[PDB]
From TrEMBL:
Subunit structure and binding partners: Interacts transiently with the RNA polymerase catalytic core.
Gene it is expressed from: rpoD
The protein, known as: RNA polymerase sigma factor RpoD
Compartments in which it is found: Cytoplasm
The organism's place on the tree of life at top rank: Bacteria
DNA sequence: ATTGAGGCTGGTCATGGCGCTCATAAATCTGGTATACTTACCCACATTGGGGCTGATTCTG
């Protein structure tokens, strides 16, 4: 959310929630793919497994 | 107890598969950005310590 706030633009006329949701979900998924296993697995291989 | 030959001590010449080193390259590993709108989870005992009384000696109106 802080990262999304750092790059939000209000001139487009869209609400902040639509822009912030993408960043929040991307950060959450990246964290899950990074630090949720005892043995680290790369993001591309995690995506292939999914 | 000598001088005439064999077996065995010195080095020749490369030789040959092995190992360390250079370089190429596609597969693997990292960082990055997405714009209709989504807003508060889900058993039974014994002992010591803390907090609320319970008088019981000091002082009071």
């Amino acid at each position: 959310l802080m990262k999304a706030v750092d790059k939000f633009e209000y001139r487009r006329g869209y609400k902040f929630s639509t822009y912030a949701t993408w960043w929040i979900r991307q950060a959450i998924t990246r964290s899950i793919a990074d630090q949720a296993r005892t043995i680290r697995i790369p993001v591309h291989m995690i995506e292939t497994i999914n």
